[PDB]
């Protein structure tokens, strides 16, 4: 529909199943609904691991870099998937979250060590 503003954004459309998510990485308007109209579907992300224990992430890089060079904004999970794939640099939020997880482990090991004695 006609909008007053908005911008092209590569995001994840949560079109899936109950207790079973499945994201469609699409490039849509920022004023459009999540599962609504889009311009062109890029890829697909399966959050749940399959029988082989792999989270299937599918990226159409040839259209992703085209829309990025045309001016498409990116979301935080999209940049996270690109950083995990290696098409984009690793996100500072992923780096700091891994550091925080390491600090939580470093606190829990000392707590479990001081609990036994």
């Amino acid at each position: 529909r006609a909008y007053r503003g908005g911008h092209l954004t590569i995001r994840l459309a949560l079109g899936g199943c109950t207790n079973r998510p499945f994201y469609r990485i699409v490039a849509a308007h920022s004023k459009c609904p999540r599962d609504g109209r889009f311009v062109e579907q890029l890829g697909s992300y399966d959050p749940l691991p399959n029988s082989h224990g792999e989270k299937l992430v599918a990226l159409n890089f040839d259209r992703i870099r085209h829309w990025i060079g045309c001016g498409a904004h990116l979301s935080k999970p999209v940049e996270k998937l690109l950083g995990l794939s290696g098409f984009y640099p690793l996100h500072p939020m992923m780096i700091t979250n891994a550091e925080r997880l390491r600090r939580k482990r470093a606190r829990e090991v000392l707590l479990a060590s001081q609990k036994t004695d």
């Binding site: 290696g86 098409f87 984009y88 640099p89």
Partner: protein, 213 residues
């Protein structure tokens, strides 16, 4: 769209003219528009409360026009700085006032709009720009005997690498793209950083209308 039985809606077009007349006739003056209740931190005009992080700089500092109303020619050619700039940027960042237009409706004369020349981190811009965030309570005035001392800045070169290695997958994309064409060159691909210079969040953005060329 275009139909033979469309109706000539005149009220919708009359209300546009009425609202456009009201916008300029009942245009709120900036003196009462930027007013502030220093006890509850609430704007009397709009009705919004200031953020929690701005409560100290309102009660302990002053704004630009509040220290510019006590100047002979409203500070022509004078330099004004900001507390946040003096706190974060060790480099001299000031504003060379070229023209000031205060609001005459104010009873204390502490509001107005001005233009000037911006020198952020020593870099002097040779274009005239309107000064931004005048109603902010962070402006500070530098005396006359320090006008030459505060401007003393050492132009030092930057140490940012001019070329950065590509991400792994994108680098392998070029390593496999140029290989199929018969290019035996094993040179490492680099990513340019010249046109990727970005200004920090403290850099004020222009307010003038951008002209399409």
């Amino acid at each position: 769209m275009a139909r033979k039985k469309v109706r000539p809606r005149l009220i919708a077009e009359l209300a546009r003219r009425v609202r456009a007349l009201r916008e300029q006739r009942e245009r709120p003056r900036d003196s009462q528009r930027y007013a502030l209740d220093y006890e509850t931190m609430m704007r009397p005009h709009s009705g919004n409360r200031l953020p929690m992080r701005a409560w100290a700089d309102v009660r302990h500092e002053s704004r630009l026009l509040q220290l510019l109303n006590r100047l002979p020619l409203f500070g022509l050619g004078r330099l004004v700085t900001r507390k946040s700039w003096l706190w974060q940027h060790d480099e001299p960042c000031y504003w060379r006032l070229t023209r000031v237009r205060p609001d005459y409706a104010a009873e204390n004369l502490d509001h107005g709009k001005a233009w000037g020349i911006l020198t952020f981190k020593g870099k002097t811009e040779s274009e005239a720009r309107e000064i931004e965030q005048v109603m902010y309570h962070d402006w500070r005035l530098v005396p006359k005997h320090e006008e030459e001392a505060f401007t003393a800045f050492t132009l030092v070169p930057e140490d940012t690498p001019l070329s950065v290695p590509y991400p792994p997958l994108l680098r392998a994309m070029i390593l496999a793209q140029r290989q199929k064409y018969g290019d035996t060159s094993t040179e490492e691909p680099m990513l340019n950083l010249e046109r990727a210079r970005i200004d920090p969040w403290d850099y004020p953005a222009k307010l003038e209308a951008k002209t399409k060329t």
